[PDB]
Amino acid sequence: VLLKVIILGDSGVGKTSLMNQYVNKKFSNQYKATIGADFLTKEVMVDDRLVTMQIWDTAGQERFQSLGVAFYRGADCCVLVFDVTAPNTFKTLDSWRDEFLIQASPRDPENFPFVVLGNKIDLENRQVATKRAQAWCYSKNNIPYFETSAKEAINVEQAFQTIARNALKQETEVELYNEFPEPI
Ligand SMILES: Nc1nc2c(ncn2[C@@H]2O[C@H](COP(=O)(O)OP(=O)(O)NP(=O)(O)O)[C@@H](O)[C@H]2O)c(=O)[nH]1
Ligand SMILES: [Mg+2]
């Protein structure tokens, strides 16, 4: 069982840092723009079951985005990341959510698993309030929200445990749908 997870969000919010903290327990203050989309794989235990997570890191800069997007299809979970110190990055979440739905075209979009990460909470200059972020998540059919720090490894393991569990649930349903579709 391979679980495909896609991480989306504006340039600089910490997508690559979150993935590298989780997969490699390493963090760099140095910024290196992500070009295109590619993945790291990690074997993880999901509620006592072994699965391989294919975690796709993507370019936040539009000029660096891959032209091809076939990889979104079949995705099991989409991670939306914003920077709590940068309100513009929280305001683009609907566009990211919509781009994911359009490229992945999942059946039953309202129940597709999304997980939102408000990153860089270690910084002193926060501008996006937890209540405002939670209100948005609730309005998107109650998606899970975690405040993280990739720099200080705060809530990273916890967020990815829910990402893995929800992605497994989704993979499980798609497989069931293919073999036993429910009637109309
Ligand atoms: N203080 C702090 N800095 C962070 C955190 N996560 C990432 N950064 C810093 O923020 C900058 C951008 O991080 P990066 O992971 O490259 O962001 P990204 O979303 O992958 N950008 P892109 O879409 O362009 O590839 C880096 O200098 C990194 O060190 C965090 O939790 N706290
Ligand atoms: Mg990156």
* 34 CA: nearest ligand 1 atom: 25
Q: Distance between CA atoms of 11 and 86, rounded to whole angstroms?
A: 11
Helix boundaries (H) for 35-146: 87-91, 93-104, 130-139
Category of 31 on φ-ψ map: left (φ > 0), alpha (ψ -120 to 50) or beta: beta
- Token pair, residue 22, equals 């989780």
- Spacing, Cα 49 to ligand 1 middle (Å): 31
Sheet containing strand 114-119, edge to edge, reads 37-45, 50-58, 2-8, 77-83, 114-119, 145-147
Superfamily of domain 1-184: P-loop containing nucleotide triphosphate hydrolases (3.40.50.300)
**Which 3 state secondary structure label does DSSP give 46?**
coil
Contact present, 135 and 88 (Cβ < 8 Å)? no
DSSP for 18-48, written as a single string: HHHHHHHS---SS-----SEEEEEEEEESSS
Q: DSSP letters along 141-166, please?
A: TS--EEE-BTTTTBSHHHHHHHHHHH
5 and 55 Cβ atoms separated by less than 8 Å: yes
Q: Is the distance from the beta carbon of residue 88 to the nearest atom of ligand 1 less than 6 Å?
A: no
Query: Of 16, 17, 23, 38, which is best to mutate to test ligand 1, by the most ligand atoms within 8 angstroms of its C-beta?
Result: 17
Report yes or no: 78 and 104 within 8 Å, Cβ to Cβ: yes
What was the structure determination method?
Answer: X-ray
Q: What residues does each domain of the chain span?
A: 1-184
Instruction: Collect residues with CB below 5 Å from ion ligand 2.
Output: 15-16, 34
* Cα–Cα nearest to 60, from 87, 92, 85: 92
Resolution of the experimental structure, in angstroms: 1.7
Q: Which structure tokens are listed for 7?
A: 């991480």
Question: Pocket of ligand 1, candidates 7, 8, 16: which has the most ligand atoms within 8 Å of its Cβ, to mutate?
Answer: 16
Cα–Cα distance between 101 and 92 in angstroms, integer?
Answer: 15
DSSP state of 182: P
Binding site membership of 85 for ligand 1 (Cβ less than 6 Å): no
